[PDB]
């Protein structure tokens, strides 16, 4: 029983109303769905990488939706209401940031840059200010300060763990949600943390390992995702 299907994942119900299955597909899309393809095994690797990184973040006290790894494509996660914001954290310039400020890809920032987007396909995920978020009551003042603190802490944790296996975390996107029926719920990290949601460059060569291999038609897409999995030791025995 499907509850939701997005561009790369399906959420399935379980017999427990408060737990759902996050199922990783092999679909990839880019440029507001102008470009789509099947990349065999991409979902398996994203499942393993995300479950791995969620657990690394849990180990440092980050609250997440992750419950358990079930199989090659699936993990058990908390059923939560997703806040309709994408938080993008940037360490170097890349993607549409580079393009709109005409700053070269790979330009390092003095401090990380957080940008917020309203998650909406129809509107192509428009950027929003803090005041917008607050006016529309998507978060309270306290939640918005918290989401930024958590995002930066997550950036530090992920940046370090990737650096230690020879990968630069260029930028990444987070989504958060809140527990059912709890108006005082803290912010739980949701969606995925994978090469679909993080720009990841090999430190020595600047080779891109992530979804940019698909976006920029660089070939060896699965090989990049597999390199990330291998270097992380994310694939179970
Ligand atoms: Cl971008
Ligand atoms: Cl950092």
Short mmCIF file of C-alpha atoms and ligand atoms in Angstrom, two decimals:
data_model
loop_
_atom_site.label_atom_id
_atom_site.label_comp_id
_atom_site.label_asym_id
_atom_site.label_seq_id
_atom_site.Cartn_x
_atom_site.Cartn_y
_atom_site.Cartn_z
CA UNK A 1 0.00 0.00 0.00
CA UNK A 2 1.55 3.25 -1.28
CA UNK A 3 1.12 6.43 0.79
CA UNK A 4 3.38 8.70 -1.28
CA UNK A 5 5.58 8.48 -4.32
CA UNK A 6 8.10 11.18 -5.11
CA UNK A 7 10.68 11.35 -7.84
CA UNK A 8 13.06 8.69 -6.39
CA UNK A 9 11.31 6.99 -3.45
CA UNK A 10 7.97 5.37 -2.51
CA UNK A 11 6.60 5.46 1.02
CA UNK A 12 4.62 2.28 1.86
CA UNK A 13 2.26 1.72 4.75
CA UNK A 14 2.84 -1.02 7.31
CA UNK A 15 0.41 -2.66 9.78
CA UNK A 16 1.76 -0.17 12.34
CA UNK A 17 0.08 3.23 11.58
CA UNK A 18 3.08 5.12 12.98
CA UNK A 19 5.78 3.34 10.96
CA UNK A 20 6.26 3.44 7.19
CA UNK A 21 8.68 1.89 4.70
CA UNK A 22 10.91 4.18 2.69
CA UNK A 23 11.58 2.34 -0.57
CA UNK A 24 14.36 3.59 -2.88
CA UNK A 25 13.67 3.41 -6.61
CA UNK A 26 16.26 3.43 -9.41
CA UNK A 27 14.61 6.42 -11.06
CA UNK A 28 16.65 9.63 -11.36
CA UNK A 29 15.31 12.95 -12.65
CA UNK A 30 16.82 16.39 -13.28
CA UNK A 31 15.92 19.94 -14.38
CA UNK A 32 12.36 19.92 -13.10
CA UNK A 33 11.78 16.52 -14.75
CA UNK A 34 13.00 17.58 -18.21
CA UNK A 35 15.41 14.60 -17.92
CA UNK A 36 14.61 11.16 -16.41
CA UNK A 37 16.37 7.77 -16.48
CA UNK A 38 16.61 4.42 -14.76
CA UNK A 39 20.02 3.89 -13.11
CA UNK A 40 20.05 0.26 -12.05
CA UNK A 41 21.07 -0.16 -8.38
CA UNK A 42 21.04 3.59 -7.56
CA UNK A 43 18.25 3.06 -5.03
CA UNK A 44 20.02 0.24 -3.31
CA UNK A 45 23.13 2.33 -2.87
CA UNK A 46 21.11 5.37 -1.73
CA UNK A 47 19.26 3.19 0.80
CA UNK A 48 22.55 1.89 2.24
CA UNK A 49 24.26 5.30 2.21
CA UNK A 50 21.28 7.10 3.78
CA UNK A 51 20.68 4.51 6.51
CA UNK A 52 24.44 4.64 7.24
CA UNK A 53 24.57 8.44 7.45
CA UNK A 54 21.31 8.67 9.43
CA UNK A 55 22.86 6.36 12.03
CA UNK A 56 26.07 8.44 12.11
CA UNK A 57 23.92 11.49 12.78
CA UNK A 58 21.86 9.66 15.43
CA UNK A 59 25.15 8.71 17.15
CA UNK A 60 25.85 12.45 17.57
CA UNK A 61 22.38 13.18 18.94
CA UNK A 62 20.55 14.27 15.81
CA UNK A 63 16.85 13.25 15.88
CA UNK A 64 15.86 11.42 12.68
CA UNK A 65 13.03 9.39 11.19
CA UNK A 66 15.27 6.33 10.86
CA UNK A 67 14.21 3.13 12.66
CA UNK A 68 15.86 0.18 10.93
CA UNK A 69 17.39 -1.03 7.65
CA UNK A 70 15.02 -3.71 6.25
CA UNK A 71 16.52 -4.86 2.96
CA UNK A 72 18.45 -3.72 -0.16
CA UNK A 73 15.90 -1.03 -1.09
CA UNK A 74 14.00 -0.33 2.10
CA UNK A 75 14.26 1.11 5.54
CA UNK A 76 11.68 1.40 8.29
CA UNK A 77 11.07 4.98 9.35
CA UNK A 78 8.80 7.00 11.63
CA UNK A 79 5.61 8.28 10.06
CA UNK A 80 5.93 12.07 10.41
CA UNK A 81 4.50 15.21 8.80
CA UNK A 82 7.13 16.74 6.57
CA UNK A 83 7.61 20.50 6.83
CA UNK A 84 7.42 21.78 3.26
CA UNK A 85 10.89 23.42 3.28
CA UNK A 86 14.14 22.17 1.71
CA UNK A 87 17.17 23.40 3.64
CA UNK A 88 20.21 23.72 1.40
CA UNK A 89 23.60 24.01 3.08
CA UNK A 90 26.53 25.13 0.88
CA UNK A 91 30.25 24.83 1.61
CA UNK A 92 31.44 25.60 -1.91
CA UNK A 93 29.61 27.25 -4.79
CA UNK A 94 27.90 24.82 -7.14
CA UNK A 95 24.77 24.27 -9.20
CA UNK A 96 22.29 27.12 -9.53
CA UNK A 97 24.12 29.14 -6.85
CA UNK A 98 27.19 29.35 -9.11
CA UNK A 99 25.03 30.20 -12.08
CA UNK A 100 22.93 32.97 -10.50
CA UNK A 101 25.84 34.76 -8.76
CA UNK A 102 28.29 33.99 -11.61
CA UNK A 103 30.76 32.51 -9.11
CA UNK A 104 32.90 29.58 -10.32
CA UNK A 105 31.91 26.03 -9.23
CA UNK A 106 34.12 25.07 -6.26
CA UNK A 107 34.63 28.56 -4.88
CA UNK A 108 34.88 28.05 -1.10
CA UNK A 109 32.87 30.14 1.30
CA UNK A 110 34.26 31.61 4.48
CA UNK A 111 31.32 30.12 6.34
CA UNK A 112 28.54 27.76 5.18
CA UNK A 113 25.54 29.27 3.44
CA UNK A 114 22.05 28.08 4.26
CA UNK A 115 19.25 28.73 1.81
CA UNK A 116 15.58 27.78 2.22
CA UNK A 117 13.18 26.62 -0.50
CA UNK A 118 9.48 25.95 -0.49
CA UNK A 119 9.01 22.33 -1.68
CA UNK A 120 6.53 22.59 -4.58
CA UNK A 121 6.82 21.02 -8.03
CA UNK A 122 4.23 23.36 -9.61
CA UNK A 123 6.29 26.42 -8.54
CA UNK A 124 9.68 24.74 -9.13
CA UNK A 125 10.70 24.94 -5.45
CA UNK A 126 10.94 28.73 -5.06
CA UNK A 127 13.41 30.21 -2.61
CA UNK A 128 11.86 31.65 0.54
CA UNK A 129 13.14 34.00 3.22
CA UNK A 130 12.93 33.38 6.93
CA UNK A 131 10.16 35.95 7.24
CA UNK A 132 8.18 34.04 4.63
CA UNK A 133 8.59 30.79 6.58
CA UNK A 134 7.47 32.56 9.75
CA UNK A 135 4.57 34.48 8.16
CA UNK A 136 3.18 31.33 6.60
CA UNK A 137 3.70 29.57 9.96
CA UNK A 138 5.66 26.67 8.48
CA UNK A 139 7.96 27.04 11.50
CA UNK A 140 7.95 29.13 14.66
CA UNK A 141 10.78 31.52 15.49
CA UNK A 142 12.30 28.95 17.88
CA UNK A 143 12.06 26.14 15.26
CA UNK A 144 13.69 28.27 12.59
CA UNK A 145 16.66 29.07 14.82
CA UNK A 146 16.81 25.34 15.73
CA UNK A 147 16.68 24.17 12.11
CA UNK A 148 19.67 26.36 11.29
CA UNK A 149 21.66 25.12 14.33
CA UNK A 150 20.84 21.49 13.43
CA UNK A 151 21.69 22.06 9.75
CA UNK A 152 25.10 23.48 10.62
CA UNK A 153 25.78 20.68 13.16
CA UNK A 154 24.80 18.11 10.50
CA UNK A 155 27.10 19.90 8.05
CA UNK A 156 30.00 19.63 10.52
CA UNK A 157 29.39 15.93 11.23
CA UNK A 158 28.92 14.93 7.58
CA UNK A 159 31.79 17.15 6.37
CA UNK A 160 34.16 15.48 8.80
CA UNK A 161 33.11 11.94 8.08
CA UNK A 162 33.37 12.49 4.31
CA UNK A 163 36.72 14.27 4.65
CA UNK A 164 38.09 11.28 6.56
CA UNK A 165 37.34 9.03 3.57
CA UNK A 166 38.67 11.56 1.06
CA UNK A 167 35.45 13.25 -0.06
CA UNK A 168 34.49 16.93 0.08
CA UNK A 169 30.91 17.69 1.04
CA UNK A 170 30.23 20.52 -1.37
CA UNK A 171 26.60 21.14 -0.48
CA UNK A 172 23.51 19.18 0.52
CA UNK A 173 19.74 19.37 1.03
CA UNK A 174 17.83 18.40 4.17
CA UNK A 175 14.14 18.00 4.96
CA UNK A 176 12.63 17.79 8.39
CA UNK A 177 9.31 16.68 9.81
CA UNK A 178 7.47 16.56 13.08
CA UNK A 179 5.77 13.81 15.02
CA UNK A 180 2.17 13.07 14.59
CA UNK A 181 -0.17 14.58 16.97
CA UNK A 182 2.53 16.26 19.01
CA UNK A 183 2.37 20.06 18.81
CA UNK A 184 5.65 20.21 20.79
CA UNK A 185 7.46 17.75 18.52
CA UNK A 186 11.13 18.53 17.90
CA UNK A 187 12.41 18.59 14.31
CA UNK A 188 13.23 15.14 12.93
CA UNK A 189 15.53 14.72 10.00
CA UNK A 190 13.65 12.95 7.18
CA UNK A 191 13.94 12.17 3.42
CA UNK A 192 17.44 10.85 2.59
CA UNK A 193 21.09 11.69 2.84
CA UNK A 194 22.70 10.31 -0.26
CA UNK A 195 24.44 11.20 -3.53
CA UNK A 196 20.95 12.27 -4.76
CA UNK A 197 20.89 15.01 -2.07
CA UNK A 198 24.62 15.85 -1.44
CA UNK A 199 27.23 17.15 -3.86
CA UNK A 200 30.30 15.01 -3.14
CA UNK A 201 33.68 15.53 -4.78
CA UNK A 202 36.76 13.38 -4.51
CA UNK A 203 39.31 15.61 -2.74
CA UNK A 204 42.39 14.71 -4.77
CA UNK A 205 40.83 14.97 -8.31
CA UNK A 206 37.68 17.02 -7.84
CA UNK A 207 35.77 14.18 -9.52
CA UNK A 208 32.03 14.51 -8.84
CA UNK A 209 30.57 11.39 -7.24
CA UNK A 210 26.94 12.44 -6.92
CA UNK A 211 23.77 13.08 -9.00
CA UNK A 212 25.70 15.80 -10.94
CA UNK A 213 27.17 12.88 -12.91
CA UNK A 214 23.67 12.39 -14.28
CA UNK A 215 22.79 16.11 -14.53
CA UNK A 216 25.97 16.93 -16.48
CA UNK A 217 25.93 13.65 -18.47
CA UNK A 218 29.38 12.65 -17.21
CA UNK A 219 28.69 8.91 -17.36
CA UNK A 220 29.74 6.43 -14.66
CA UNK A 221 26.79 7.50 -12.50
CA UNK A 222 26.46 4.24 -10.62
CA UNK A 223 30.25 4.03 -10.21
CA UNK A 224 30.24 7.39 -8.40
CA UNK A 225 27.47 6.31 -6.03
CA UNK A 226 29.27 2.99 -5.48
CA UNK A 227 32.52 4.80 -4.71
CA UNK A 228 30.72 6.80 -2.01
CA UNK A 229 29.25 3.56 -0.61
CA UNK A 230 32.58 1.79 -0.65
CA UNK A 231 34.51 4.62 0.99
CA UNK A 232 31.84 4.90 3.68
CA UNK A 233 31.73 1.09 4.20
CA UNK A 234 27.95 1.50 3.96
CA UNK A 235 27.05 -1.81 2.31
CA UNK A 236 26.26 -4.58 4.82
CA UNK A 237 27.61 -8.16 4.55
CL1 LIG B 1 21.51 24.06 -6.50
CL1 LIG B 2 32.35 22.43 7.61
#
